Curated annotation (Swiss-Prot):
The record marks 2-3 as: Cleavage. GO terms for molecular function: hormone activity; neuropeptide Y receptor binding. The peptide YY form is cleaved at Pro-2 by the prolyl endopeptidase FAP (seprase) activity (in vitro) to generate peptide YY(3-36). It is found in: Secreted. This is Peptide YY.
Amino acid sequence: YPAKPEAPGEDASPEELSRYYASLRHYLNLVTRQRY
């Protein structure tokens, strides 16, 4: 499994849409931890 929340839609409400979208980038941030 991709271990990521699938992108919202399916007639989802606009306020929920905002919170949910932020979580997408949040998980993606864990996949970008280059050796600094």
